[PDB]
Design a protein around this motif. Structure first.
Motif, PDB file in Angstrom:
ATOM      1  N   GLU A  65      50.457  16.845  53.645  1.00 58.06           N
ATOM      2  CA  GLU A  65      50.533  16.354  52.215  1.00 58.06           C
ATOM      3  C   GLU A  65      49.886  14.791  52.209  1.00 58.06           C
ATOM      4  O   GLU A  65      50.929  14.030  52.482  1.00 58.06           O
ATOM      5  N   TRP A  66      48.680  14.486  52.086  1.00 55.02           N
ATOM      6  CA  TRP A  66      48.210  13.113  52.308  1.00 55.02           C
ATOM      7  C   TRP A  66      48.665  12.500  51.045  1.00 55.02           C
ATOM      8  O   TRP A  66      48.745  11.098  50.989  1.00 55.02           O
ATOM      9  N   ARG A  67      49.082  13.183  49.784  1.00 57.89           N
ATOM     10  CA  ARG A  67      49.376  12.588  48.441  1.00 57.89           C
ATOM     11  C   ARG A  67      50.847  11.792  48.615  1.00 57.89           C
ATOM     12  O   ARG A  67      50.902  10.823  48.047  1.00 57.89           O
ATOM     13  N   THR A  68      51.752  12.156  49.667  1.00 56.57           N
ATOM     14  CA  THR A  68      52.960  11.387  49.913  1.00 56.57           C
ATOM     15  C   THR A  68      52.939  10.666  51.248  1.00 56.57           C
ATOM     16  O   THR A  68      53.682   9.557  51.291  1.00 56.57           O
ATOM     17  N   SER A  69      52.662  11.630  52.292  1.00 60.23           N
ATOM     18  CA  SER A  69      52.993  11.340  53.730  1.00 60.23           C
ATOM     19  C   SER A  69      51.596  10.645  54.205  1.00 60.23           C
ATOM     20  O   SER A  69      50.389  11.100  54.312  1.00 60.23           O
ATOM     21  N   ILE A  70      52.095   9.367  54.875  1.00 56.47           N
ATOM     22  CA  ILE A  70      50.948   8.656  55.611  1.00 56.47           C
ATOM     23  C   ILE A  70      50.604   9.050  56.768  1.00 56.47           C
ATOM     24  O   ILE A  70      49.497   8.975  57.129  1.00 56.47           O
ATOM     25  N   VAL A  71      51.494   9.969  57.526  1.00 55.36           N
ATOM     26  CA  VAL A  71      51.029  10.285  58.837  1.00 55.36           C
ATOM     27  C   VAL A  71      50.313  11.693  58.529  1.00 55.36           C
ATOM     28  O   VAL A  71      49.480  11.854  59.606  1.00 55.36           O
ATOM     29  N   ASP A  72      50.258  12.103  57.466  1.00 54.44           N
ATOM     30  CA  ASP A  72      49.558  13.430  57.353  1.00 54.44           C
ATOM     31  C   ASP A  72      48.026  13.088  57.247  1.00 54.44           C
ATOM     32  O   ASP A  72      47.155  13.737  57.767  1.00 54.44           O
ATOM     33  N   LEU A  73      47.694  12.235  56.598  1.00 55.81           N
ATOM     34  CA  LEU A  73      46.324  11.891  56.213  1.00 55.81           C
ATOM     35  C   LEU A  73      45.777  11.067  57.394  1.00 55.81           C
ATOM     36  O   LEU A  73      44.485  11.193  57.565  1.00 55.81           O
ATOM     37  N   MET A  74      46.472  10.472  58.132  1.00 54.14           N
ATOM     38  CA  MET A  74      46.059   9.801  59.343  1.00 54.14           C
ATOM     39  C   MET A  74      45.637  10.825  60.479  1.00 54.14           C
ATOM     40  O   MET A  74      44.496  10.784  60.952  1.00 54.14           O
ATOM     41  N   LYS A  75      46.660  11.765  60.630  1.00 47.95           N
ATOM     42  CA  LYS A  75      46.361  13.003  61.616  1.00 47.95           C
ATOM     43  C   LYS A  75      45.188  13.677  60.997  1.00 47.95           C
ATOM     44  O   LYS A  75      44.441  14.297  62.144  1.00 47.95           O
ATOM     45  N   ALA A  76      44.936  13.747  59.873  1.00 48.48           N
ATOM     46  CA  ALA A  76      43.780  14.462  59.528  1.00 48.48           C
ATOM     47  C   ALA A  76      42.513  14.244  59.618  1.00 48.48           C
ATOM     48  O   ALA A  76      41.602  15.053  59.830  1.00 48.48           O
ATOM     49  N   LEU A  77      42.270  12.615  59.479  1.00 47.91           N
ATOM     50  CA  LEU A  77      41.067  12.150  60.249  1.00 47.91           C
ATOM     51  C   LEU A  77      41.089  12.183  61.726  1.00 47.91           C
ATOM     52  O   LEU A  77      40.205  11.630  62.447  1.00 47.91           O
ATOM     53  N   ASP A  78      42.040  12.842  62.096  1.00 48.75           N
ATOM     54  CA  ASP A  78      42.095  12.954  63.673  1.00 48.75           C
ATOM     55  C   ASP A  78      42.655  11.712  64.344  1.00 48.75           C
ATOM     56  O   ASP A  78      42.020  11.146  65.090  1.00 48.75           O
ATOM     57  N   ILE A  79      44.008  11.194  64.267  1.00 47.46           N
ATOM     58  CA  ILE A  79      44.299   9.995  64.768  1.00 47.46           C
ATOM     59  C   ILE A  79      45.427  10.367  65.688  1.00 47.46           C
ATOM     60  O   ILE A  79      46.129  11.397  65.299  1.00 47.46           O
ATOM     61  N   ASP A  80      45.725   9.716  66.822  1.00 49.87           N
ATOM     62  CA  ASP A  80      46.651  10.058  67.876  1.00 49.87           C
ATOM     63  C   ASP A  80      48.137  10.353  66.941  1.00 49.87           C
ATOM     64  O   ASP A  80      48.712  11.496  67.171  1.00 49.87           O
ATOM     65  N   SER A  81      48.361   9.485  66.281  1.00 51.22           N
ATOM     66  CA  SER A  81      49.710   9.729  65.595  1.00 51.22           C
ATOM     67  C   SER A  81      51.023   9.608  66.409  1.00 51.22           C
ATOM     68  O   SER A  81      52.205   9.553  66.051  1.00 51.22           O
ATOM     69  N   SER A  82      50.498   9.116  67.849  1.00 50.93           N
ATOM     70  CA  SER A  82      51.530   8.832  68.749  1.00 50.93           C
ATOM     71  C   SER A  82      52.038   7.593  68.754  1.00 50.93           C
ATOM     72  O   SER A  82      51.997   6.751  67.565  1.00 50.93           O
TER      73      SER A  82
END
Length: 130
Positions: A65-82
Motif C-alpha cells: 500500500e504505497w498510498r499510505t505506507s512509505i516503506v511499501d513504495l520504497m521496497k516496490a522500486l526495490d530499495i533495501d528497506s534495511s
C-alpha cells in the motif's frame, strides 16, 4: 544517499511506452499492413504516479500500500528497506527517531518523501495528499 531521488529515477523514467493508458496489445502480422502510420508523440507534463506504483508494487511480488505506507513504495522500486536505507532517507529529510518509533516514522517519512517526489511534476490520485 537520497532514496526520494533514487525511487523517482524509475517513476519519472517511463520510456517503455507504458505510461497511463499507453500500453497496447500485440497483433499478428504478414498480410496485416492495413493501418495508418502517423505516430504523433505523447507528451506528459504531468507524471501520473498511480499507474506507475500500482503496477510496480505487484511487479515487486507482494501486494503493498504505497498510498499510505512509505516503506511499501520504497521496497516496490526495490530499495533495501534495511538499516542503511531507512537511515539515509530519513536523515536527508531531517531524521526523527526519539520515541516516535516506526509508528510515527511511517507517517512523517511518507509526508516528507512525497513533498520531494511529486513536486517534480508527479500527479497523485485524489486520496494521496500529505
Amino acid at each position: 544517499m537520497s532514496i526520494f531521488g533514487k525511487i523517482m529515477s524509475a517513476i519519472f523514467g517511463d520510456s517503455a511506452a507504458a505510461s497511463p493508458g499507453g500500453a497496447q496489445a500485440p497483433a499478428t502480422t504478414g498480410a496485416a499492413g492495413t493501418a495508418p502510420t502517423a505516430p504523433q508523440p505523447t507528451a506528459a507534463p504531468s507524471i501520473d504516479v498511480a499507474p506507475i506504483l500500482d503496477k510496480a508494487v505487484k511487479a515487486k511480488g507482494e501486494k503493498l500500500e504505497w498510498r499510505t505506507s512509505i516503506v511499501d513504495l520504497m521496497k516496490a522500486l526495490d530499495i533495501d528497506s534495511s538499516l542503511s536505507a531507512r537511515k539515509e532517507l530519513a536523515k536527508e529529510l531531517g531524521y526523527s527517531g526519539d520515541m516516535n518509533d516506526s509508528a510515527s516514522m511511517n507517517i512523517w517519512l511518507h509526508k516528507q518523501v512525497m513533498s520531494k517526489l511529486v513536486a517534480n511534476g508527479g500527479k497523485l490520485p485524489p486520496e494521496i495528499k500529505h
